[PDB]
Structure to design on (286 residues):
């Protein structure tokens, strides 16, 4: 009741803040060509995915007060497909961003040649295709169930096998592989930063490189912190059939809320970790 309305209020606050912040990030990235760097290309996709995953929160939150789904199965389809597209889009974007830094640092000669913004958009597109390859089935099997109590929105499968096959294809192809690629790149960029006195030659350029890479790593770590709980809980709850409990329900709600709040946390990180973003957030906001 009171607790439920506080949960709804928190979800509404997260919805508004995340949508506004991610819209602002997309606009600031699109505003100027000097802000169209390769890192900004992937930041654009990350913010786009966050905005898409946040736009459905009013529907996802109104349900707590009714136990019913009046919005429609089409909207149910879209919301359920968004919930899955978000994980793949964002993690793949971060993996591509962390791989790009390796080309920038350890192979600067070919870095500028292969990191054109057209190539960045191409690796954004490929991320989209690979995510769609496991996202489209979610929408194609997502439909509402006309329960006796109240209509509900849920997935369907033909259902103990594929329901877990999708979970494995997420935990493997969308968490562990991208994390393992990010680590494999960073473990070598970090050594190339120290073993090389100056990377880009120009001291200002080297400082900009070591700072943009730090922001990329910070965003990557923020995403990992925010999303590891939900992935791990999703895997474990199915693995050991954890039964219903007060602590279990609270932890589930907290994990989902943190995963959704990452979307509105990203704007804070961009504001607190980049001179360009910080200046623009006041420039367009005044
Ligand atoms: C508040 C509305 N709500 C959402 C849910 C469930 N969601 C949460 C977690 C999921 C998930 C995460 C990891 C692995 C996996 O296989 C599935 C979703 C795909 C994404 C949702 C989320 O939090 O990321 C924005 C979906 C099933 C239940 N209620």
């Amino acid at each position: 009741m009171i607790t439920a309305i506080t949960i709804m209020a928190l979800y509404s606050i997260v919805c508004v803040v995340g949508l506004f912040g991610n819209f602002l990030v997309m606009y600031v990235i699109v505003r100027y060509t000097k802000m169209k760097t390769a890192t900004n290309i992937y930041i654009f996709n990350l913010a786009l995915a966050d905005a898409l995953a946040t736009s459905t929160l009013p529907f996802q939150s109104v349900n707590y007060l009714m136990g019913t789904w009046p919005f429609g199965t089409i909207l149910c389809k879209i919301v359920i497909s968004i919930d899955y597209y978000n994980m793949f889009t964002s993690i793949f974007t971060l993996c591509t961003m962390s791989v790009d830094r390796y080309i920038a640092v350890c192979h600067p000669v070919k870095a500028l040649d292969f990191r054109t913004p057209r190539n960045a958009k191409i690796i954004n597109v490929c991320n989209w295709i690979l995510s769609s390859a496991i996202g489209l089935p979610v929408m194609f099997m997502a439909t509402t169930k006309y329960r006796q109590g109240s209509i509900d929105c849920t997935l369907t499968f033909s259902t103990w096998y594929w329901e877990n096959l999708l979970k494995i294809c997420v935990f493997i192809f969308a968490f562990i592989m991208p994390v393992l690629i990010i680590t494999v790149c960073y473990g070598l960029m970090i050594l190339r930063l120290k073993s090389v006195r100056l990377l880009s030659g120009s001291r200002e350029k080297d400082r900009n490189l070591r700072r943009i890479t730090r922001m990329v790593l910070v965003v990557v770590a923020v995403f990992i912190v925010c999303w590891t709980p939900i992935h791990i809980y999703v895997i474990i709850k199915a693995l050991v059939t954890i039964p219903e409990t007060t602590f279990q329900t609270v932890s589930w709600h907290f994990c989902i809320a943190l995963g959704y709040t990452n979307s509105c946390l990203n704007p804070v990180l961009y504001a607190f970790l980049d001179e360009n973003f910080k200046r623009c957030f006041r420039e367009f906001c005044i």
User: Anything to note?
Assistant: The longest strand covers residues 142-145.
